[PDB]
Structure 1
């Protein structure tokens, strides 16, 4: 809980100010991307894509006026620059994936994710209603894609690399 989330150089992950890659510890070849799900015409679901590494960088944000992130904080997670709320993560029921990670254009004050230590890195945990019980984000294989989606007990484990290559 009171543990500070750190990047792959061991430094505290910043609150909103920097972008970071979520690098899978057992799938370092793959990176986050947006893909189509169900019948949508725009790509709105987040996949682990073997074609892109390190993938789309994200920012972790808390309303707290602190510039570090702890594992106990509720976080919004978003693609894109801080000035934009068009790539905000949410978890949305979608058949046949399940509870799929998707991107939206609206942000609540408190997001529903936490970043929690797991194995050698961190998993993303979704808290429906921001209550006490969290659901692990892992991978759901459907239609030739590996979708980030709830898979409780089967988390995809990531390490967090500051996105200074850009």
Structure 2
């Protein structure tokens, strides 16, 4: 339930600021979009070795507070704060499985949490708010790391403010 912190030791803001997720296990990797299955348009959220420091995200909570706690249920999104595209969700899709993807809507409370993990943070997906979490990790397929549910095997990020 501590406050989520960026690399400069500042609390992460509620929607106001965008942050690069920086893997600590893949220096050359950054966040981006890839196609999955039969889709014309890229909708799956990937780490790309070919792409640092990454597309930046916002962490968003309906709570009228401008700090993020590890305990808050979040929406994570690419793009501007208020807008309703680039909102993260998990979709069961081959060949990846429980894949992190973007969509054009937003729920009141997101299904994601940011949690201290060893030396940094992991994203944890919650299919429902009462239940325990599913760490988000990486599926190496067709030369990239698709973000997807891999419990016990999280991808660790530092949160760098885009500035």
Deviation at 1:103, TM superposition (A): 0.2
TM-score by length of 2: 0.98
Deviation at 1:29, TM superposition (A): 1.3
Correspondence for 2:28: 29
CA distance in 2, matches of 1:158, 1:145: 17
CA distance in 2, matches of 1:101, 1:150: 8
Unaligned runs of 5+ in 1: none
Cα deviation code 1:109-145 (max 9, x no counterpart): 0000000000110000000022321100000112222
Cα deviation code 1:33-55 (max 9, x no counterpart): 00000010000000100111111
When the two chains are superposed, the root-mean-square deviation of aligned CA atoms in Å is 0.8
Q: Describe the SS at the equivalent of 1:42.
A: coil
Moved over 4 A (4+): none
Count of equivalent residues: 163
Cα deviation code 1:42-100 (max 9, x no counterpart): 00000100111111000000000000000000000000011311100000000121100
Q: Describe the SS at the equivalent of 1:38.
A: coil
Contact 2:14–2:60, Cα closer than 8 Å, also in 1: yes
Comparing 124-133 and 6-15, the one that deviates more: 124-133
CA distance in 2, matches of 1:66, 1:39: 41
Q: Describe the SS at the equivalent of 2:128.
A: helix
CA distance in 2, matches of 1:112, 1:47: 18
Unaligned runs of 5+ in 2: none
TM-score by length of 1: 0.96
Deviation at 1:26, TM superposition (A): 1.5
Deviation at 1:155, TM superposition (A): 0.2
CA distance in 1, matches of 2:53, 2:143: 20
